[PDB]
Amino acid sequence: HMMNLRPSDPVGASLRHLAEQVHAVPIGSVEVPDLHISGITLRSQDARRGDLFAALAGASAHGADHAADAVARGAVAVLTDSAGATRLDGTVPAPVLVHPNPRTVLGELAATVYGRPADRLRVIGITGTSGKTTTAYLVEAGLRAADRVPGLIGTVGVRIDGMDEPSALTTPEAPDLQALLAVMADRGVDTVVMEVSSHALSLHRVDGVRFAVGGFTNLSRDHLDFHPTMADYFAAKARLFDPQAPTCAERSVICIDDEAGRAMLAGAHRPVSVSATGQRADWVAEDVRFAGPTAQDFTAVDPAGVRHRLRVGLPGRFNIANCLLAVALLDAVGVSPAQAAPGLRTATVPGRLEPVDRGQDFLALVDYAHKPGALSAVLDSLRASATGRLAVVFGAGGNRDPGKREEMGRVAAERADLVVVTDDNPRDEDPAAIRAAIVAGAKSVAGQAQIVEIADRREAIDHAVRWAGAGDVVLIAGKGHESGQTRGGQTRPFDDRAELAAALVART
Numbered sequence: 001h002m003m004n005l006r007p008s009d010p011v012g013a014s015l016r017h018l019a020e021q022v023h024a025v026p027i028g029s030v031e032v033p034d035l036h037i038s039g040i041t042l043r044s045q046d047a048r049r050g051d052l053f054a055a056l057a058g059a060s061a062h063g064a065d066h067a068a069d070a071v072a073r074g075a076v077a078v079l080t081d082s083a084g085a086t087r088l089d090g091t092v093p094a095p096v097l098v099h100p101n102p103r104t105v106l107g108e109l110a111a112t113v114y115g116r117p118a119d120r121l122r123v124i125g126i127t128g129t130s131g132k133t134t135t136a137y138l139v140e141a142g143l144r145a146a147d148r149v150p151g152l153i154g155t156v157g158v159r160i161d162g163m164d165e166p167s168a169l170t171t172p173e174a175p176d177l178q179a180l181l182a183v184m185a186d187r188g189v190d191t192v193v194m195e196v197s198s199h200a201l202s203l204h205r206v207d208g209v210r211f212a213v214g215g216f217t218n219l220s221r222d223h224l225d226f227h228p229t230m231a232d233y234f235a236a237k238a239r240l241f242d243p244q245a246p247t248c249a250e251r252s253v254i255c256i257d258d259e260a261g262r263a264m265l266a267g268a269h270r271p272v273s274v275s276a277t278g279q280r281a282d283w284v285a286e287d288v289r290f291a292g293p294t295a296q297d298f299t300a301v302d303p304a305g306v307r308h309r310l311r312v313g314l315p316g317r318f319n320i321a322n323c324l325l326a327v328a329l330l331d332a333v334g335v336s337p338a339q340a341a342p343g344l345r346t347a348t349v350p351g352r353l354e355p356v357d358r359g360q361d362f363l364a365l366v367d368y369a370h371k372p373g374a375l376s377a378v379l380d381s382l383r384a385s386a387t388g389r390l391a392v393v394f395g396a397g398g399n400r401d402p403g404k405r406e407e408m409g410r411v412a413a414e415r416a417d418l419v420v421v422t423d424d425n426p427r428d429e430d431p432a433a434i435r436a437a438i439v440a441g442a443k444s445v446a447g448q449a450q451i452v453e454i455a456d457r458r459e460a461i462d463h464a465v466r467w468a469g470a471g472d473v474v475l476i477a478g479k480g481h482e483s484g485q486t487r488g489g490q491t492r493p494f495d496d497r498a499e500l501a502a503a504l505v506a507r508t
């Protein structure tokens, strides 16, 4: 029954001032009161003394049906839409405001209520198809090494001043994010690094955030079950860099190693370009050197002409680009490469090319990639002379884009020496039919990959671990930091890191 995290003593705001700020109007004939509002939420179970409850239309349900409960829990006022109003007329003992489309103003209302936390610290937002999480963790580690106090908001969770924050949401709505930024400022955070997804930029979830710096990794095909076309997907991410958009960051740090990045740079507010593929850019990586199985040395060249010799403590060639972007973002908030370097060398990223070491003589790691494009990239990222043979173990989710299954098999069989097709959250589907589609795609490739099908994921991990010899690479893909195997409405624990470690201890 743990309610969502709020700042302990927010400045708050008068309801009348909030109504004037966003052109909300009273539901009825009574003028908006100067009632003190100390919080805002869209979830009645998170409502508490002093809150404005946002009662909004949603999936086959309207929050107005929960407004009486929110007020009973201590909310002192309600903000709703026209539909909600007709349903709240004279039913709750609290003032009600109506707005044409409240979802579009919740972020700015929460910014006011929580004291404009994005003006108390520097917010870095990072968007792009892949690399948001790794880049964010590298930035957080660089800030800590520089003796700054960082906050991190990402897919895995939230961390504040070096401490996990389990009471915060990983995918906050706009009011939740403002509350979390205020908590961070209260706890001494001077710089927040957060992932900003195309969903968030399309659904008003980062409205009201002043972004000091925006970063762009790359774009490839993804999220087309939400965006109608690639052009809509690009346009959503462009909202972080377009000077005409209210979400535009004050400085844009853009990787130009793909077509989308080059186009983003051309229209971006106050652009800084970054390239780890040899192209001309303000920041470039050069002189990349092998540094053992889980580290890579490189030189970051800054726009002033200074060469910084650095180490990123991650495997995978594309992590040079993520580290270079992290370095440029850190510079944009006043952290030098030398100050950040100890953090870049030691950072760990949960579920993103995350190695597990139990003393074996080969590289064994877990990665989140669960779609063909990301899987192709991570397999390519692990291709290098040091890499003997490469094995990948994965499956595909039930009740998730079935059209990707053959393609995942294809991309794996084009790149890996051993492809182990197993189960990964078959959910309400026939698990054997999912594996069959992946296997068919893998077999359609002309090459020399060995294709093995093992339904049980523990057995599949075990098979790959037993197969590996000195200098080989074993990749367990598709779950990353996410624990669980869901079948027919039941979920059993299954953490790929724990299961990989157990196989390594047993077999190695």
Ligand SMILES: Nc1ncnc2c1ncn2[C@@H]1O[C@H](COP(=O)(O)OP(=O)(O)O)[C@@H](O)[C@H]1O
Residues within 6 Å of the ligand: 128, 129, 130, 131, 132, 133, 134, 135, 155, 195, 217, 218, 318, 319, 321, 322, 352, 353, 367, 368, 369, 370, 374, 377, 378
């Ligand atoms: N710069 C990159 N280019 C291509 N693929 C990447 C990059 N960074 C990470 N990946 C891969 O894509 C997936 C998502 O990586 P992550 O670092 O979580 O990105 P995001 O947070 O943008 O989803 C992982 O499975 C990883 O293998």
Ligand SMILES: N[C@H](CCC[C@H](N)C(=O)O)C(=O)O
Residues within 6 Å of the ligand: 370, 396, 397, 398, 400, 424, 425, 478, 479, 482
């Ligand atoms: N958590 C995300 C990714 C899961 C990826 C893969 N493990 C799967 O279950 O399809 C989801 O629910 O779509």
Ligand SMILES: [Mg+2]
Residues within 6 Å of the ligand: 129, 197, 222, 223
């Ligand atoms: Mg995504």
Ligand SMILES: [Mg+2]
Residues within 6 Å of the ligand: 132, 133, 155, 195
């Ligand atoms: Mg992510």
Ligand SMILES: [Mg+2]
Residues within 6 Å of the ligand: 156, 157, 158, 164, 165, 166
């Ligand atoms: Mg957690």
